[PDB]
Amino acid sequence: TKKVAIILANEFEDIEYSSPKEALENAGFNTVVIGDTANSEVVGKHGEKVTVDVGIAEAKPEDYDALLIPGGFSPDHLRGDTEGRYGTFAKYFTKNDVPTFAICHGPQILIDTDDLKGRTLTAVLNVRKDLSNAGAHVVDESVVVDNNIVTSRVPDDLDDFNREIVKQLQL
Amino acid sequence: TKKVAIILANEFEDIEYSSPKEALENAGFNTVVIGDTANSEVVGKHGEKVTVDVGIAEAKPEDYDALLIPGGFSPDHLRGDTEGRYGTFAKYFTKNDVPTFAICHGPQILIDTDDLKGRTLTAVLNVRKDLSNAGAHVVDESVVVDNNIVTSRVPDDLDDFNREIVKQLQLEHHHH
Numbered sequence: 001t002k003k004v005a006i007i008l009a010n011e012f013e014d015i016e017y018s019s020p021k022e023a024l025e026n027a028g029f030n031t032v033v034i035g036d037t038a039n040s041e042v043v044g045k046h047g048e049k050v051t052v053d054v055g056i057a058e059a060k061p062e063d064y065d066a067l068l069i070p071g072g073f074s075p076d077h078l079r080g081d082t083e084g085r086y087g088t089f090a091k092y093f094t095k096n097d098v099p100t101f102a103i104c105h106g107p108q109i110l111i112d113t114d115d116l117k118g119r120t121l122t123a124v125l126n127v128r129k130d131l132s133n134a135g136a137h138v139v140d141e142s143v144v145v146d147n148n149i150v151t152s153r154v155p156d157d158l159d160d161f162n163r164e165i166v167k168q169l170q171l
Numbered sequence: 172t173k174k175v176a177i178i179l180a181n182e183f184e185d186i187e188y189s190s191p192k193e194a195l196e197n198a199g200f201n202t203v204v205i206g207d208t209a210n211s212e213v214v215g216k217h218g219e220k221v222t223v224d225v226g227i228a229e230a231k232p233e234d235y236d237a238l239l240i241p242g243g244f245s246p247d248h249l250r251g252d253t254e255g256r257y258g259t260f261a262k263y264f265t266k267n268d269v270p271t272f273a274i275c276h277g278p279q280i281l282i283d284t285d286d287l288k289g290r291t292l293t294a295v296l297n298v299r300k301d302l303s304n305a306g307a308h309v310v311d312e313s314v315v316v317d318n319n320i321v322t323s324r325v326p327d328d329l330d331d332f333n334r335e336i337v338k339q340l341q342l343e344h345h346h347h
Contacts, residue, residue: 076247126250
């Protein structure tokens with residue numbers, strides 16, 4: 001069975017967590033929440049409460065068949081980690097071309113891999129300049145697939161994002 | 172009239188607005204909040220309400236003698252402006268070397284000017300990588316002054332931040 005890591009902090013955009021989660025689980029895939037502490041709770045922008053499954057210190061990126069990065073301000077919180085552990089976690093995925101899914105602000109965490117030069121990505125407008133300065137070819141589309149990396153911009157894009165992410169995992 | 176523009180959206184970090192504002196106003200300078208629509212309210216992370224003085228469609232950066240950018244998630248919101256009008260607004264201050272003050276996340280808007288290459292600043296950890304990628308020399312200090320650009324990291328830096336921003340405005344008119 002295939003298993004998706006979801007990196008999450010406080011102030012995720014609720015639907016960007018729950019909608020891709022549902023779509024993966026409907027297609028028969030497992031999901032697991034990676035966060036600061038096992039059994040700590042993080043709370044979405046609109047009050048959705050999520051329990052962290054696995055602490056970032058313990059997580060073994062090789063256990064996972066994909067990485068999902070929900071947007072809102074969760075990615076900005078994650079980039080506050082004083083040891084940069086979420087970027088380092090995400091680097092396993094970009095370095096080994098493991099399916100990597102990021103919506104809205106989510107691709108902020110990808111910047112910290114240093115792996116974006118020459119890659120084609122979209123994101124929420126707020127973050128596009130920073131993605132470009134990280135070396136990405138940034139476009140403005142509802143969903144972008146660049147080999148293993150699937151990105152979308154906003155919650156309106158979810159239908160497209162969700163289709164493309166479960167497809168990528170079927171391989 | 173030496174007037175400081177403050178670009179502000181929702182979810183600014185309250186005291187990064189109120190403390191610098193007070194220090195500027197104590198030192199005799201006026202402040203003008205610039206936002207999406209004039210006479211609307213924006214609300215801090217901890218619920219401070221601030222009225223927007225001037226709409227960003229109306230604002231002329233010429234009118235002002237400094238630019239102050241409070242942090243929190245206000246700068247991120249401002250970067251979601253569809254036409255990028257707050258980056259454009261800030262481009263005047265960076266191009267013409269006008270006093271430019273930013274704390275925490277605040278330097279994110281300075282990235283949109285494309286004027287950061289070779290400049291030296293600090294910011295909250297979360298945005299340091301993005302400043303580097305924009306070509307800035309990023310350091311970790313309580314306050315950094317690079318000619319006209321004043322930056323700090325976090326709320327505990329405010330005593331240092333506020334000293335330097337007022338000192339920029341005083342020196343602008345040769346008072347020592």
